[PDB]
Design a protein around this ligand. Structure first.
Ligand SMILES: *C(=O)/C=C/N[C@@H](C(=O)O)[C@](C)(Cn1ccnn1)[SH](=O)=O
Ligand SMILES: C[C@](Cn1ccnn1)([C@@H](N)C(=O)O)[SH](O)O
Length: 267
């Protein structure tokens, strides 16, 4: 079966790369298409920034936040990998929309913390997950501590199936207005950090958008959506490979993308 090939090929990567690979693919209604270690806990790291943007747009939709609100900050806001936040520092602020775009498309960590402060912190992020029917995903810390990925630590974790269903809810399940949905989808497509990961394993003609993550202890993740053969899918991929190089971890995620492609095209 196509399903057996999918399992076998993922386990081949696990064995040869000494990795753990979590995968969930669901349809727009959140029904399972395929999975691997789908109920296993993995650190979200930067993948959570996609849900964070959804939270922000939900508040914009509800009129309790404005995209043009200026969020002021100083040097203390700058953390490792804050390319946009550093550029805007002299000006003294980034708007909500600028910060959200930087968080999603550049994985800017300063901008992420700036937004977290504005919307109510990890508590607010976790409440949002709960609100959209995700009882699993949880944010406990901010950048950079949330990326520690200490084995067995439940902080700042999700499971592939929980996250994939969250992506589906946000993009296909009416969590946001069509306008806000479209804005986030286009940001995901135009993301600048995912060229070497999941989408490098998908066919050139698929419409795909995604958000990457990188965790200590060899974490490399990618979540998002793709349209293939006129059907829409939500996908979450979490990997851990402590002994691989950074480039090899990119290649691993792209390889998982190729395995996903083979399954999807066989159906
Ligand atoms: C989202 O995935 C953010 C990841 N942040 C990591 C990373 O990109 O690997 C940081 C930047 C790792 N780090 C520490 C010192 N220099 N890079 S950090 O925010 O954990
Ligand atoms: C990998 C980054 C952060 N980064 C980039 C360069 N050094 N750190 C991480 N936040 C991610 O998205 O996985 S990003 O550029 O993709």
């Amino acid at each position: 079966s196509e399903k057996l090939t999918f399992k076998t090929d993922l386990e081949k990567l696990e064995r040869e790369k000494a990795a753990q690979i979590g995968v969930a693919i669901v349809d727009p209604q959140g029904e399972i298409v395929a999975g691997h270690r789908m109920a296993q806990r993995f650190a979200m790291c930067s993948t959570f920034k996609f849900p964070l943007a959804a939270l922000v747009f939900e508040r914009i939709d509800s009129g309790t936040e404005r995209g043009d609100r200026k969020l002021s900050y100083g040097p203390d806001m700058i953390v490792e990998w804050s390319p946009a936040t550093e550029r805007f520092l002299a000006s003294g602020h980034m708007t909500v929309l600028e910060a959200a775009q930087a968080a999603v498309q550049l994985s800017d960590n300063g901008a992420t913390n700036l937004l977290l402060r504005e919307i109510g912190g990890p508590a607010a992020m976790t409440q949002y997950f709960r609100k959209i029917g995700d009882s699993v995903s949880r944010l406990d810390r901010k950048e950079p501590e949330m990326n520690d990925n200490t084995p067995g630590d439940l902080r700042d974790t999700t499971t592939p199936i929980a996250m994939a269903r969250t992506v589906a809810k946000v993009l296909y399940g009416g969590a946001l207005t069509s306008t806000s949905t479209h804005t986030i989808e286009r940001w995901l497509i135009g993301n600048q950090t995912g060229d070497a990961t999941l989408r490098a394993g998908f066919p050139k003609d698929w419409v795909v958008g995604e958000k990457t993550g990188t965790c200590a202890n060899g974490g490399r993740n990618d979540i998002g959506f793709f349209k293939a053969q006129e059907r829409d899918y939500a996908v979450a991929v979490y990997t851990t490979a402590p002994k691989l190089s950074a480039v090899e971890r990119d290649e691993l995620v792209a390889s998982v993308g190729q395995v996903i492609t083979q399954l999807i095209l066989s159906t």
